[PDB]
Amino acid sequence: VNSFSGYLKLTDNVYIKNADIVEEAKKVKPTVVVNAANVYLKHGGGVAGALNKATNNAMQVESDDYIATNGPLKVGGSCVLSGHNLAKHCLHVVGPNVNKGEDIQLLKSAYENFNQHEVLLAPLLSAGIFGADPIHSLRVCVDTVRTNVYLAVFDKNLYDKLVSSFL
Ligand SMILES: CNC(=O)[C@@H]1CCCC[C@@H]1Nc1ncnc2[nH]c3cc(F)ccc3c12
């Protein structure tokens, strides 16, 4: 039993909800919140911009030190950093950005990072400003992640479309 409330159950381990991941993280304080990161950990917009703003830019400060030491992530890769005031840890995961021409076949590799964590609060990778089809992203998530994932979907209209079309 965990503290996540009001989710629809899609499968044994995947749950989906209409919620602002920022407000959801601040309330649940989950062990792991997933960020929709880019390779440079430049948290400028989308989910990443929202999470960073909620940390009063501390996420960005930590991220810049990480990149200065380690260099950029791989598309499809991830790193574990602090969750600041939102969660114990933030798993920064790089889904492919269709608006940059990146291979959508890397979306499965991106979701594989979730399997290193027993329970996660997460957005749909590569959705939103990353330009991929959120319906497809949900399919890859369900078919790739084996650990317990709680998806927060900000847009209520998108949430209903995701549920109504789920197979
Ligand atoms: C990297 N991909 C994206 O940003 C996507 C673009 C639009 C479709 C959904 C998805 N974003 C989100 N998913 C869950 N919670 C969210 N809270 C937010 C607060 C904000 F200010 C901005 C965006 C989100 C957001």
Assess if residue 16 is contained within a domain: yes
- Rounded-to-integer distance, Cα 63 and Cα 81, Å: 8
Residue 1 belongs to a domain: no
Experimental technique for the deposited model: X-ray
Cα-flanking dihedrals φ and ψ of residue 89, to 5°?
Answer: -130, 150
CB 46 less than 6 A from any atom of ligand 1: yes
Measured from the Cα of 19, ligand 1's closest atom is 15
Does residue 57 form part of some domain? yes
Q: Resolution of the experimental model in angstroms, please?
A: 1.0
Q: Whose CA is nearest to atom 8 of ligand 1?
A: 128
The atom of ligand 1 lying closest to the CA of 46 is 4
Q: How many domains does the chain have?
A: 1
CA distances from 161 to 6, 75, 91, 134 (A): 17, 28, 27, 10
The answer to whether residues 76 and 109 touch, using CB atoms and an 8 Å cutoff, is yes
Q: Which domain holds residue 109?
A: 8-163
Asked whether 36 lines ligand 1 (CB < 6 A), one says yes
What CATH number did the domain enclosing 149 receive? 3.40.220.10
Please give the Cα distance from 100 to 78 (Å, whole number). 18
Query: Which atom in ligand 1 lies closest to the alpha carbon of residue 158?
Result: 8
